[PDB]
From Swiss-Prot:
It is an enzyme of class 3 (hydrolase). This is Endolysin. It is found in: Host cytoplasm. It comes from the Viruses. Changing S117V: 50-fold decrease in enzymatic activity. It comes from Enterobacteria phage T4. The gene is E. The keyword Flavoprotein does not apply. Endolysin with lysozyme activity that degrades host peptidoglycans and participates with the holin and spanin proteins in the sequential events which lead to the programmed host cell lysis releasing the mature viral particles. Once the holin has permeabilized the host cell membrane, the endolysin can reach the periplasm and break down the peptidoglycan layer. Its main location: host cell. It catalyses: Hydrolysis of (1->4)-beta-linkages between N-acetylmuramic acid and N-acetyl-D-glucosamine residues in a peptidoglycan and between N-acetyl-D-glucosamine residues in chitodextrins. InterPro entries: Endolysin_T4_type, Glyco_hydro_24, Lysozyme-like_dom_sf, Lysozyme_dom_sf, Phage_lysozyme-like, T4-type_lysozyme. Changing T26E: Complete loss of activity at neutral pH; covalently bound substrate.
């Protein structure tokens, strides 16, 4: 399994504008369009993003294009972030995927706020970090996904996605 397969299990694929678990306007593979309540503002962002008049609908192709860009941006942002970089560098491949997954869902900023857990991942205290990560809004709001990610950090294997 790789980062793209992992995220695609967690995010799913929708070719029509839809609402986040959060109520936000999204499309494709977890590509957030706007936090604004107007379907019109979301439509506008979409067309801006794709470079065409979409009318709220995209092709598989366009979805995957946005996905490649979003993954690329997540990694780069990790790399540019003074708090994320050292953690990422300290981790092995599988675990790096788990961090990337968090960044994709919650943004650089969001994850950089998990100070204590980051410290614990850096120290390679897997069990301790899994307990701390669970004490969050994140886990309470999207428990099945948080659990898969947390398992990955804990175990260093892809078994949580084995099932899925």
């Amino acid at each position: 399994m790789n980062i793209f397969e992992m995220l695609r299990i967690d995010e799913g694929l929708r070719l029509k504008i839809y609402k986040d678990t959060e109520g936000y306007y999204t499309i494709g593979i977890g590509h957030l369009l706007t936090k604004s309540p107007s379907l019109n503002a979301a439509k506008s962002e979409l067309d801006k993003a794709i470079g065409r008049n979409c009318n709220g609908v995209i092709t598989k192709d366009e979805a995957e294009k946005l996905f490649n860009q979003d993954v690329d941006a997540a990694v780069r942002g990790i790399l540019r972030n003074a708090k994320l970089k050292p953690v990422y560098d300290s981790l092995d491949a599988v675990r790096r995927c788990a961090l990337i997954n968090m960044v994709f869902q919650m943004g650089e900023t969001g994850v950089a706020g998990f100070t204590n857990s980051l410290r614990m991942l850096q120290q390679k205290r897997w069990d301790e970090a899994a307990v701390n990560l669970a004490k969050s809004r994140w886990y309470n709001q999207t428990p099945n996904r948080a659990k898969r990610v947390i398992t990955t950090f804990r175990t260093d294997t892809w078994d949580a996605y084995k099932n899925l």
